[PDB]
Write a protein that binds this ligand. Structure first.
Ligand SMILES: CCCCCCCCCCCCCCCCCC(=O)OC[C@H](COP(=O)(O)OCCN)OC(=O)CCCCCCCCCCCCCCCCC
Ligand code: SF4
Lengths: 52, 182
């Protein structure tokens, strides 16, 4: 029932692989790029700061 | 105070010439540096590049020197978006408390030489919002100003008067002759 037949010192800290062969990837948090259309931008009409 | 001279006195006076530093300076090196400074100021007063800044209503007048009645591209003046590619920033509009580090950063990232035109009463001294909490009392107290265009909306005639007076200031600007006399 171990990960291997004969657990060594390094090997015995492992866990059993899942009986289902499929391991779904986890959903990790993503930090997107913070770009501001600041005031100097001509599309921002002079005094608008869009923190996109 | 002096007035413009009478046409008899004007006929008595000779022509001024293009050079504001005079014809001769009694030295070959001084004459060469003065003519190099004349060529450099001709290259600098020709095609100053203002900055797309446009804080407020005075900006709408700024497009009336873009508009084909007045045509700022005739003088070499042409807008560039980046402050690195600009000689002039036309501070025109209300400078508020949130725009103090914005204007200081945009002016500081602009490269030397730097000349700032203050267009409009809000940019000169606060104007109609001088006594408010949020408006900075003119743009002098954050950034240096070389030209003060005085009208609240200036006429585009009066804005190009400030632009031409800035061109005359660059024409009188002397650096190589100063280097020779430093
Ligand atoms: C022939 C082609 C080359 C001519 C070079 C002429 C140089 C001297 C000169 O006359 O420059 C004209 C002007 C400054 O002279 P200014 O006093 O304005 O006018 C003379 C009035 N008789 O100077 C200018 O407008 C610019 C002069 C550029 C000089 C470049 C460096 C020369 C060394
Ligand atoms: S100076 Fe006059 S026209 Fe210019 S931004 Fe102020 S109120 Fe508007």
């Amino acid at each position: 029932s171990g990960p291997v037949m004969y657990p060594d010192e390094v090997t015995s800290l492992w866990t059993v692989p899942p009986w289902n062969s499929k391991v779904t990837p986890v959903e990790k948090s993503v930090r997107n790029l913070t770009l501001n259309f600041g005031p100097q931008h001509p599309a921002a009409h002079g005094v608008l700061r869009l923190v996109l | 105070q002096q007035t413009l001279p009478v046409a008899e006195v004007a006929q008595n006076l000779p022509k001024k010439g293009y050079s504001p530093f005079g014809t001769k300076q009694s030295s070959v090196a001084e004459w060469s540096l003065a003519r190099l400074d004349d060529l450099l100021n001709w290259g600098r007063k020709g095609s100053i590049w203002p900055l797309t800044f446009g804080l407020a209503c005075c900006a709408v007048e700024m497009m009336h020197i873009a508009a084909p009645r007045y045509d700022m591209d005739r003088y070499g003046v042409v807008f560039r978006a980046s402050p690195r590619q600009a000689d002039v920033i036309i501070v025109a509009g209300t400078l508020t408390n949130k725009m103090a580090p914005a204007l200081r950063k945009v002016y500081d990232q602009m490269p030397e030489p730097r000349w700032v035109i203050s267009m409009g009463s809000c940019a000169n001294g606060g104007g109609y919002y001088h006594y408010s909490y949020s408006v900075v009392r003119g743009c002098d107290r954050i950034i240096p100003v070389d030209i003060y265009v005085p009208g609240c909306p200036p006429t585009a005639e009066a804005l190009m008067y400030g632009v031409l007076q800035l061109q005359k200031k660059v024409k009188r600007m002397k650096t190589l002759q100063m280097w020779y006399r430093k």
